[PDB]
Design a protein around this ligand. Sequence first.
Ligand SMILES: Nc1ccn([C@@H]2O[C@H](COP(=O)(O)OP(=O)(O)OC[C@H]3Oc4nc5nc(N)nc(O)c5nc4C(S)=C3S)[C@@H](O)[C@H]2O)c(=O)n1
Ligand code: FES
Ligand code: FES
Ligand code: FES
Ligand code: FES
Ligand SMILES: [Ca+2]
Ligand SMILES: [Mg+2]
Ligand SMILES: [Mg+2]
Ligand SMILES: [Se]
Ligand SMILES: [Se]
Lengths: 420, 420, 157, 160
Amino acid sequence: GKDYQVLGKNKVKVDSLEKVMGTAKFAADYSFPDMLYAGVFRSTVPHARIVSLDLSKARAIDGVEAVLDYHAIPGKNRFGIIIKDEPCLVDDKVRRYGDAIAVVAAQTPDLVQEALDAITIEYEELEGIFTMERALEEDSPAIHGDTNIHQVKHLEYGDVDAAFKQCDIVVEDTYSTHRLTHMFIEPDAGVSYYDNEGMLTVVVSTQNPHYDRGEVAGMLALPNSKVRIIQATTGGGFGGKLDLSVQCHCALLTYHTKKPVKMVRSREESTTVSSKRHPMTMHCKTGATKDGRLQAVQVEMFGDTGAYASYGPAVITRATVHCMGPYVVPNVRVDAKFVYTNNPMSGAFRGFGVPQASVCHEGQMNALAKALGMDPIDIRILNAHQVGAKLATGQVLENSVGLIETLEKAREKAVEVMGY
Amino acid sequence: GKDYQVLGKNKVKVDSLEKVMGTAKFAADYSFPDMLYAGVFRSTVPHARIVSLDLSKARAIDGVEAVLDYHAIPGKNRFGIIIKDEPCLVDDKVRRYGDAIAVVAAQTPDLVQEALDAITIEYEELEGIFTMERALEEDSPAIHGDTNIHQVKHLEYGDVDAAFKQCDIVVEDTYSTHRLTHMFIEPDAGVSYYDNEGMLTVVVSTQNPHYDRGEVAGMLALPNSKVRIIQATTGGGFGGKLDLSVQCHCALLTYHTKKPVKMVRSREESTTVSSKRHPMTMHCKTGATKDGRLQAVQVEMFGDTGAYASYGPAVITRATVHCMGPYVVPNVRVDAKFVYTNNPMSGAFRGFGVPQASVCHEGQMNALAKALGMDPIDIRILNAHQVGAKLATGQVLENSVGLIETLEKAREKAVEVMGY
Amino acid sequence: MNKITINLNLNGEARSIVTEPNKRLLDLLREDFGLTSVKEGCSEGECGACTVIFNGDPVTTCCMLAGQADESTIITLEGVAEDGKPSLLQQCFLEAGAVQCGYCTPGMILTAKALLDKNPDPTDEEITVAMSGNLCRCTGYIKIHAAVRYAVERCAN
Amino acid sequence: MNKITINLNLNGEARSIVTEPNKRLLDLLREDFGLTSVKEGCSEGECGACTVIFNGDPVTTCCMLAGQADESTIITLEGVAEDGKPSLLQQCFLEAGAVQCGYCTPGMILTAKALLDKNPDPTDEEITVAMSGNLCRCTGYIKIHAAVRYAVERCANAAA
Ligand SMILES: Nc1ccn([C@@H]2O[C@H](COP(=O)(O)OP(=O)(O)OC[C@H]3Oc4nc5nc(N)nc(O)c5nc4C(S)=C3S)[C@@H](O)[C@H]2O)c(=O)n1
Ligand code: FES
Ligand code: FES
Ligand code: FES
Ligand code: FES
Ligand SMILES: [Ca+2]
Ligand SMILES: [Mg+2]
Ligand SMILES: [Mg+2]
Ligand SMILES: [Se]
Ligand SMILES: [Se]
């Protein structure tokens, strides 16, 4: 259909050969002469203040070339994919477990760990917030600024207070999705160095090399054109590699030692430090009529974005806009609030808050289909989006809409294979 | 003169840092794991067919990975910057001393030399041609095709036969220049290999990587997009690094061994094998009136292009177009004939035939000035090109012509610094 | 601690190295022999990314001490290629679409090769259980299996 | 042929290597010590590109056997930098336009430095003779000589 020269065809990928031959090099596969190894000394508490930090004994180890804290940063010390609330190295205070406090560079991996076990630190723990409830309490201690309210969106389409009176059926239920981690098979790894021509470079497992460049250049106060980021062959990301991982820590050390700095996270540290999916809770109420046509959807959701924003602003926004499934709803009300907590940093994970939202609306639909003796597919085909329909945002679908086809073709296939 | 923001300023070069720090890498400074070293077995005779070539004893040496002749080339075996008359490895016959016949790849430079010393060969020597006079004799063997005449040009402008009769003065002399070598301080060097992603690559000391690529791709029968040529920090060329040096021999050895192949030429081999400046002999007759105004120039010249064309075409035409000098001459005739000989290959050397041409046109101007008792600078200002002058090719100068300013400024400065 | 002498047959050739024993077989292969096809995805024997053919049998090199590779025959992904070219198995993985991020690929191929080197005509079930020691987060395993089934069929001829 | 032990101070640090004696000092520095700044432009003492400061004097390493570096103090270009930064002399080559292809540069800088370490305020004539063992095919030497002169003036300038 629509005869194409190469499009559609199953061509051998341009990078598969080196992957099956084993010559392909992922970040951790890179090695350079005089290359030093790096490790990060992190927090063991979730919320506190650093009263005392001693790095003297670490530095005194024969083989350790450097041990640094935020003072060592010549440029800025605030980063973030959207909101600059993430430090490279804690300066302000610890806001989570595994927060980056200091970084070490040594001749061998063991010397790294030796230098790490020699560092001592004293904390002045604060109230670690772990529930959205306690986080909303105007009483709770602000993890950021003077409030624990990160994002707040409100979508109002038509008039739901009215429509909820033209419905012969109305279902209400509270939905909740948990916390998950990308679990890409390749742990976070990177290597920074000044190349032969003096170019500060970072080879790394990432999903956005250019974003990484800005942050590094910012940290070192260098124009972007003078910082090179090479996205090495990457072993999966699924969203967990959009935030900074080792880029700044490696670069920072290469900046001070002028030598290549390799940092390869163990599975444990990789999972402990990377972002996680936003665990959400969604209060929903959908009203429909006999025939099955939806009349109004109302949602009030909350989100635990964690110690730092990360993709939180984008998660809440995308969630708010999709919470009312791929169906035509003339009336929509949405209240969403994301809060900062001391729980693992929540960010981007395949779906951007839509998987969580899908459970909520699909749970409602299947609920209405059960209360109206309709086939879960038909009740959907009926309210399914089509070219010409109007979205809760006032946008009108003008092209590419094959939702009903995915419903029919799918059901059909199901029948043929599972007896629908 | 135009307030430029940065233009004209003595800005530190973007590549000077690596050069003063010693980190800049020239081709020979590159080394890779499992890299082999390569050398070339070259002819010791000027013109001859190869009766026999034994590579068995060279191949038997423990440590030698490959010993190849033209039979190992999968693609084409004819190359050349302008005319494809150069082989990668000699097939039909040797045309010069130092002709590349076979190549060797081994674990060490000593093994390579050992391999070369073990190769034996038998030639059927033909007549070596070393004079343009013998080359033009049609009974002399044809180094290429059916004649030793390589190029011929004729520039006819106005009418010199009529012009010379109107002249008050005519100077006639035969001029000639010699054979020179570029002598860039860095000898030819290169290294080829397949990179991590299987990309065939060649890091080389060159002046034209894109040209190099097309040749290598043509030898290995590969598309241009699948052959990477990286011009390493280059230690000078002056025209001597336009022709292929080691690119193909290296690439070929890598194609067969699949390993990195490094080839660094000794100064001797580099000079013996690289191009040279075309020696030329120019017969000139220049006429003018008493006021010192030029009326006609007639040149009959010859050039020895050596065993292969190289820039022979570019040299004969450029020299033909400029041999009257930077002066308005209403009547010019130029005959130029470049011939093939078994002398070293003549190619591009800073000037493309104009240095040789200037020896001629300036020698003429100075004899004119002396005979007419004029100041050498004045006789030149009088006939100098100016916006609007008509050139011997019919071209009229429309802009950017400051010959008279060089003349005046030069004399003014010389009066001051040398007592002109 | 004294350095130990290790003799083994790595990727078709007899090698021998004297080194400290305080390291894993995975480290020995990656660092001492430069075989970086052997990945380290978890450090606890779960992902299988560090799988290598240890005496006809696949094993997690992150669970073995360097010294234990003495007198053994080890084959890593680099040893699969035939004179620099993709073996049949490797070719099938290429055409089948069994490769996404490619981090698990080395182990997968080695497990599938170890199998096929013992059972040329395995059942889809024998194939599944055979590679159940290797985790992939990209493919869903579908197309990886297809590549193995693909190879076996072409193995018939 | 038995191997030999060579003890020397290379770029500030005491090094020791047990190697075959049949190699030039140029090969030792480039291959065994990885100092590629030491160039081989001719193999016969003419170009000076392989120059290194040897016990305080500029010498052509292609004319020397590896074992002859025993008990010596050698400084290659890599050892001129101050904490990974361009020394004054190096900064002057950068600014004076003394650098074109840059192949003769390591040698030029070392020869200049060898002179300045002995005589901080040389005459122009002394600068020339001191660097007459280094050939350049790009600059015509004009700006290379200027760079050294500029370094001498700025050095004196630092009389604060
Ligand atoms: N019309 C289309 C659409 C998609 N594709 C195929 O599917 C891929 C996905 O394309 P697209 O939907 O445009 O998404 P991106 O290329 O921007 O990939 C990012 C996306 O990719 C996903 N799948 C992943 N797959 C792998 N192997 N690894 C990850 O980390 C992944 N992370 C996730 C997450 S999260 C995201 S946001 C394309 O590369 C292509 O091979 C196609 O052939 N034709
Ligand atoms: S690192 Fe060995 S199984 Fe994962
Ligand atoms: S293809 Fe990515 S983990 Fe398997
Ligand atoms: S290579 Fe030593 S002086 Fe030229
Ligand atoms: S700058 Fe090129 S040889 Fe000196
Ligand atoms: Ca990133
Ligand atoms: Mg070239
Ligand atoms: Mg020629
Ligand atoms: Se994501
Ligand atoms: Se040239």
